[model samples]
Target: VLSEGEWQLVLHVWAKVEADVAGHGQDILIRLFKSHPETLEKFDRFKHLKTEAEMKASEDLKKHGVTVLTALGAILKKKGHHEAELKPLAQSHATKHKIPIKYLEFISEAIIHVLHSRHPGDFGADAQGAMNKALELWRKDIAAKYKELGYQG
Candidate 1:
């Protein structure tokens, strides 16, 4: 779970990553790291991995994160849960980074830009509703997993 602000940050980053990687948005990731060297420490494990391995691992984690986040987004849209529901997840991430939870917002925005660039037409509602449905399904799946694990949020 995450706080309202933390959840916003997560969604922002996820959307930014999608935009950056798929849509070729500005090199926000590079800029982000350049301006915030401390942020790199959070990804130290990834920095040392082989390029190919790192890419694969990143994609795998992104897929899972997106799945869970999309579910939370849908839940938000449907009023199924309040933004406060993300508190646990937000705290967990903050602890991992050894930073205040507010910093997650920056990370989230960067990620979303990246994703937007990589998959240009991968999000949003449309005539076919495929994108929306897919995102929703991913969220539902993650919601179930959280429940199974007795997540507090």
Candidate 2:
């Protein structure tokens, strides 16, 4: 759903950051947990690492964080295949993990913070607007699955 320019922007940005994938991914988790706190309750292991330093010291957190960002990297690369790919992903999160739809919402801020932090003024309003659209790309799929499961959120 990204505009041509937006896709180009994301692709360009991702290419630069992929080299430090672990750091970038952990930064997202770190920001989310530090800013939101309760968001970590969904993760069984991560919930114990109450602070960013603790989370960083845990090798488990490092691996999982890298995996998440790696997957997102793949999604950004594939571009057109997101709906087909994200549907099953959404279903799995709902049925398997029971992650609330609201938690997914925080990921947007996490990602935007990365973009802004990495490139300074590079991720402007237009880029942010595009990322917003991308975030909504899987909203319905996750919501529908949650609804089927009687999820109150």
Candidate 3:
């Protein structure tokens, strides 16, 4: 859904953070959990983590962060070509994994929160707007899958 110029802008910003994708992704997820502690319960692997310290030290949590960023990076690179790729992922999350749909929005906001906090100068309003739009499209793609499978709620 992003235009050519927006694609370049987002990918350019993403490249700077991609070098530390593991850390950035971890930061995004941590931010999400801190802001919405209830979401933590949704993750079977991490549901047992009772404190921020526990989350920080969890290997499973860290690996999950890497996993999310890897998927996001792949989609960002492919842009409009991600619909098919997102289907299975979304389907599993919706029907099998039982992940709440709102977590996507929460994660999206957390990503922006991490980006702007880390690189305020680079991730200004323009970049934030572009990223927001791009992320919205990604959420919609997943949401569409959730809908088709009668998992919408």
Candidate 4:
């Protein structure tokens, strides 16, 4: 759903921080959980982690973050129908973990927040707006697929 310029902006910014897969990825995950503590409830294993430090220390958290980043990377790889690649993930999350689709939207927010935090100056209005739209596109796809299954919420 992102335009050519929008995709460039996303790839430009994502390239800066993806090297430290664990660090930035974990930060994004933590950002998501901290911002919406309720989402943690879905992650029974990590939900027990009360503090950010505890979660950071967790290999489980690190691995999960990498997985998320990988999916995010897939979405940004080419632009056309990128959302479809993540559809299976959305379905699994809903069916396997019962993680409501809204949290998936929140995950997009967390990614934007972390990118902005990491590179405040780099993420100007143009970049920020594009990132938001891209995330919304993914969120819409995930939510639509979840609803397509006839599940409420």
Which candidate number has the best lDDT?
3
Model 4 is weakest, by summed lDDT over 10 consecutive residues, at 75-84
- Identify the runs in model 4 with alpha carbons over 4 angstroms from their true place: none
Candidate 2 structure quality by residue, lDDT tens digits, 27-118: 88888887778888778888877566888888888898888887777666766466556666666787777777778888768888887888
Instruction: List lDDT for all candidates, in order.
Output: 0.43, 0.75, 0.84, 0.82
Q: Give me the runs in candidate 3 sitting further than 4 Å from their true place.
A: none
Residue 95 error for model 2, in Å? 0.9
lDDT of 3 by residue, 1-153 (tens): 678888887898898888898788778888999998878878888888878788788888888999889888888888768976788788789988777668888888899999999888888888888899889888888888888888884
- Among these predictions, the greatest TM-score belongs to 3
lDDT of 4: 0.82
lDDT of 1 by residue, 1-153 (tens): 334544444354445444433222223334345455565556664345334335444654345445545544544443335435555544444344344323444544554454455545643323113333333443444445445445433
Per-candidate count of clashing residue pairs (backbone under 3 Å): 42, 0, 0, 0
The weakest ten consecutive residues by lDDT in model 3 span 76-85
For candidate 1, give the lDDT.
0.43
lDDT of 4 by residue, 52-84 (tens): 899989999999889888877887775757657
Better of 1 and 2 by TM-score: 2
* Cα error, candidate 2, residue 87 (Å): 3.0
Ordered by lDDT, highest first, the candidates read 3, 4, 2, 1
TM-score of each: 0.37, 0.85, 0.93, 0.91
